[PDB]
Amino acid sequence: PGMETLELQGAKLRYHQVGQGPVLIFIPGANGTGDIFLPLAEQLKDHFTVVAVDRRDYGESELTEPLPDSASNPDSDYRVKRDAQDIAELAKSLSDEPVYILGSSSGSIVAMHVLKDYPEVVKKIAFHEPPINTFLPDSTYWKDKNDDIVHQILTEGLEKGMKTFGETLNIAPIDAKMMSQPADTEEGRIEQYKRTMFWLEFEIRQYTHSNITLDDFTKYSDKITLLNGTDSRGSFPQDVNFYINKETGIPIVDIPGGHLGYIQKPEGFADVLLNMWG
Amino acid sequence: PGMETLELQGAKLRYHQVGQGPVLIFIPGANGTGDIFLPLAEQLKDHFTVVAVDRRDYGESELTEPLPDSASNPDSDYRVKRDAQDIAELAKSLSDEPVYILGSSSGSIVAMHVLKDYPEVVKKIAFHEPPINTFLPDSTYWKDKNDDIVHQILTEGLEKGMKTFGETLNIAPIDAKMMSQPADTEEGRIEQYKRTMFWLEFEIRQYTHSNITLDDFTKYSDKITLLNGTDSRGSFPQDVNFYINKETGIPIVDIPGGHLGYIQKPEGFADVLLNMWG
Numbered sequence: 001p002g003m004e005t006l007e008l009q010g011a012k013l014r015y016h017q018v019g020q021g022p023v024l025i026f027i028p029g030a031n032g033t034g035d036i037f038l039p040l041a042e043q044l045k046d047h048f049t050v051v052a053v054d055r056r057d058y059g060e061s062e063l064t065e066p067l068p069d070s071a072s073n074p075d076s077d078y079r080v081k082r083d084a085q086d087i088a089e090l091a092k093s094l095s096d097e098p099v100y101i102l103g104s105s106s107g108s109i110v111a112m113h114v115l116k117d118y119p120e121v122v123k124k125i126a127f128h129e130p131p132i133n134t135f136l137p138d139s140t141y142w143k144d145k146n147d148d149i150v151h152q153i154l155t156e157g158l159e160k161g162m163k164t165f166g167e168t169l170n171i172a173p174i175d176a177k178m179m180s181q182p183a184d185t186e187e188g189r190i191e192q193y194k195r196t197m198f199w200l201e202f203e204i205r206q207y208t209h210s211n212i213t214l215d216d217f218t219k220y221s222d223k224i225t226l227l228n229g230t231d232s233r234g235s236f237p238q239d240v241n242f243y244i245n246k247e248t249g250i251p252i253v254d255i256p257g258g259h260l261g262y263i264q265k266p267e268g269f270a271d272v273l274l275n276m277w278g
Numbered sequence: 279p280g281m282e283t284l285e286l287q288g289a290k291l292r293y294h295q296v297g298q299g300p301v302l303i304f305i306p307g308a309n310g311t312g313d314i315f316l317p318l319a320e321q322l323k324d325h326f327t328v329v330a331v332d333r334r335d336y337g338e339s340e341l342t343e344p345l346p347d348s349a350s351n352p353d354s355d356y357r358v359k360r361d362a363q364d365i366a367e368l369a370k371s372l373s374d375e376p377v378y379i380l381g382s383s384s385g386s387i388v389a390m391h392v393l394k395d396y397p398e399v400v401k402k403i404a405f406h407e408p409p410i411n412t413f414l415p416d417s418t419y420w421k422d423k424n425d426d427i428v429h430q431i432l433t434e435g436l437e438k439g440m441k442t443f444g445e446t447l448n449i450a451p452i453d454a455k456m457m458s459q460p461a462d463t464e465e466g467r468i469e470q471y472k473r474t475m476f477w478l479e480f481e482i483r484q485y486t487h488s489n490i491t492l493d494d495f496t497k498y499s500d501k502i503t504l505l506n507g508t509d510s511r512g513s514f515p516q517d518v519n520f521y522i523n524k525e526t527g528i529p530i531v532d533i534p535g536g537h538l539g540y541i542q543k544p545e546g547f548a549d550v551l552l553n554m555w556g
Contacts, residue, residue, distance in 0.1 A: 026540075030457065030481070031473070032473065032477070036538070039540075039541055040540045040548055043544050043548035044548050047552060058473065066344070071484075072479060072480060074483040075484070075487070077484065077489065079480060079484060079485075080484060102551070104505075104540065105447070105515070106481055106482070109485045109490070110485075112490045112494065115494070115498055115501070116490060119498060122498070122501055123501070124501050124502075124503070125503075126502070126551075127502065127505065128505035128507075128539075129515035129519065129537055130515055130518050130519065131486050131514060131515050132486050132487075132518060133518070134486075134489065134491075135490060135521075135522075136518070139487070142486070143483075143486075143487045146446065146482060146483050146486055149442075150446070150478055150479065150482065150483055153442050153478060154475075154479065157435050158431065160434060161430050164427055165427050169409065179309070195309070195310065195336065197475075200431060201350060201428075202335070202345070202349055203357065203384055204308075205352040205421075205424055205425060205428060206349075206353070206357060207384045207387045207388075207410070208387070208410050208412075208420070208424055209412050209417070209421050209424070210355060210391065210410065212387070212391065212410055212412055212413060213412075214413050217390075217393075220393055220400070220403075223401070223402050223403055224393070224402075224403055224405065225403070225405075226404070226405050227380075227404050227405065228407065232407065235407075236409060236420070237383070237407035237408060237409050238407065240407075240408050240414070241405070241407065243415075244405075259382075259383065260314070260382075261406075262314070262315055263315070263317060266317035266318045266321050267321050270321030273322065273380070273404075276404070277302075277378055277402055278325060
């Protein structure tokens with residue numbers, strides 16, 4: 001709304017444009033959207049054609065293709081180079097002459113890569129408070145500090161909500177210890193976080209309130225066995241089975257282990273499945 | 279163990295298979311991957327052809343089409359129905375007879391939908407500790423609690439996120455205040471958290487250690503201005519501009535506001551820009 005569109009490879013790039021005169025392209029930082037520049041643009045519109053971009057991963061811009069799987073790697077250069085190319089292609093569609101460019105924060109980093117890889121579109125460029133470290137002395141120190149902070153923030157946020165969730169459902173301590181144990185590797189721990197966040201957004205609410213009724217069980221009563229772990233007593237999922245059994249007559253079979261008894265006590269769990277179905 | 283693949287609409291479904299005899303399909307819960315059943319499958323492989331599935335969004339399975347946008351909706355049934363469909367088409371591809379099926383946790387919910395919508399593929403089925411609340415007398419209490427845990431993770435990321443911006447970028451706290459001001463609708467707040475998580479994983483490490491050298495600046499030193507805010511003195515980004523200035527001679531221009539001075543002091547910011555470029 002109020003925004004123009006430039007279609008590029010993998011994205012529809014949306015930007016605000018106001019004013020008259022030489023093109024001045026503003027590149028946003030962490031918020032990623034050009035609206036943060038509109039009060040500044042109002043002050044400038046008599047001297048520049050001000051262009052404030054939503055970078056392709058943000059705001060009203062939209063990817064038309066998924067990012068490469070490699071983009072989640074901390075060393076990936078795909079996004080920063082693609083953002084820089086976005087600016088250069090937006091510059092050429094708006095002007096035949098080199099333009100004015102200002103980026104702030106990560107936007108200044110994009111602007112450095114515009115200058116490096118497409119200097120032909122740069123008349124003048126400004127780097128407002130850039131947080132890049134690569135050329136600093138001992139830049140590995142700052143790279144490692146950033147990698148650590150990101151790791152800490154992501155992993156710590158989920159463990160709080162995962163404790164609360166466990167206490168709500170009265171999951172046994174044994175079970176909660178094991179379905180929250182952090183993976184033995186670096187990539188194992190990241191995949192855990194991604195897995196848990198997908199589960200939170202896309203599974204737990206959708207599945208636990210899905211359209212199942214007791215009528216759906218009684219039709220096929222003779223086929224159903226309900227399994228409660230002998231080490232997970234008092235937890236919410238056992239109450240769910242207790243209710244099904246109360247209202248349908250379908251029997252509960254007790255089985256070793258807790259909520260994860262199939263991995264906690266494999267031989268014991270198996271023995272019971274053979275009792276049932278062997 | 280190499281996994282088997284079944285190509286379905288929208289996904290390559292991957293699964294482990296061991297043993298002989300009637301088919302027995304294990305459906306995983308929140309971890310989403312069948313490998314959690316491999317010790318149990320070893321106990322049963324003399325009696326059943328054991329099949330332990332990676333549900334299509336997890337593990338070695340892979341989507342071949344994006345998830346629908348509406349899958350994010352807490353009331354969406356796309357994923358659980360598609361999960362149940364996957365199991366039934368797996369059963370038909372493995373066996374001309376109805377098969378044995380066991381799901382645990384959210385996998386037992388998938389198993390309920392398999393029995394409900396594809397009863398013809400179920401010989402016998404076990405629901406191990408299901409966390410579904412829909413048919414319970416107090417469903418609403420459990421459902422509202424789940425929505426609330428999910429809501430918790432969102433709002434804790436919001437406030438931890440103000441701590442993130444000031445501690446990842448090392449910037450004055452008034453600037454981190456503005457960078458983390460809550461969006462003014464709930465839908466906007468959900469997008470805000472996604473935008474912070476994306477920036478945290480996909481932007482800050484990749485950009486702040488991208489391949490810019492001081493030689494890249496000296497080559498176009500005449501085009502470049504470094505911008506430091508007058509209200510954000512002391513921060514790491516100003517230290518970066520100080521180092522660039524020290525090594526290349528490129529001038530630093532002070533400009534009103536802090537790290538976000540273009541919106542904090544738009545007319546003071548513009549006046550400086552016009553002295554540089556107007």
